[PDB]
């Protein structure tokens with residue numbers, strides 16, 4: 001699929017840099033015709049088929065195709081797409097309140113209610129995605145951005161669809177590996193992947209939200225991955241002594257090696273606690 005090939009600078013002015021990633025940079029921008037603000041994600045194209053630099057057109061088109069499908073309060077939407085010889089430029093909904101990662105770093109200690117308030121929104125966004133058979137495959141605090149960080153209960157949106165896939169045959173078998181700290185055992189073991197992998201990542205996020213500590217993190221990537229595959233985590237009393245047993249139950253039912261035995265997104269919403277890159 002081709003995209004708009006007019007110069008994006010004819011239509012937008014850019015400002016502050018918002019973040020960067022695998023061959024991408026994201027800049028705050030303003031559309032000239034409306035004064036409305038967006039996040040422009042400049043993704044570097046591959047210069048040759050066999051190149052390892054830049055993102056393949058197949059991978060760019062998948063991200064764009066998935067983004068075009070989604071409209072939900074807890075996910076980022078796509079406004080427009082431009083391209084030129086070197087970049088595909090995705091004009092995305094702006095999320096101005098920073099990463100959940102940075103929010104957690106600055107505050108250092110959430111209550112169960114604060115954690116649940118974030119987690120419920122994450123679960124709602126993932127419920128929408130999974131209802132559409134979209135696996136995100138890179139859920140982590142860096143990929144959950146706050147609308148406004150200066151309210152008591154910040155609203156969030158899931159970002160970064162660079163690894164997301166449609167799962168129309170229950171599982172996908174590639175070619176898919178997220179951040180070691182957050183990937184499921186099936187990712188570590190290069191097994192077929194489905195929506196269940198996101199549920200594992202939600203378990204890891206929940207553990208971090210409640211404790212400020214990462215359940216599987218070793219001193220090297222290989223150690224983290226070995227820990228993940230072995231389900232080598234525990235609830236440290238120093239961090240969890242005043243955390244409810246129900247919260248621990250929720251995490252325990254997500255951090256399960258066999259993807260078939262793991263809670264689904266629907267299970268997670270009915271759970272009594274809730275119900276009202278890989279190489280060194």
Ligand SMILES: Nc1ncnc2c1ncn2[C@@H]1O[C@H](COP(=O)(O)OP(=O)(O)NP(=O)(O)O)[C@@H](O)[C@H]1O
Nearest residue numbers: 018019020021022024026039092093094095160162
């Ligand atoms: N819609 C948005 N609003 C505000 N900031 C954003 C938005 N999208 C991305 N960012 C920031 O830009 C960073 C990189 O964007 P992302 O979409 O994760 O690119 P990426 O190349 O897939 N990263 P990686 O997963 O490391 O390869 C994010 O971590 C955010 O800090």
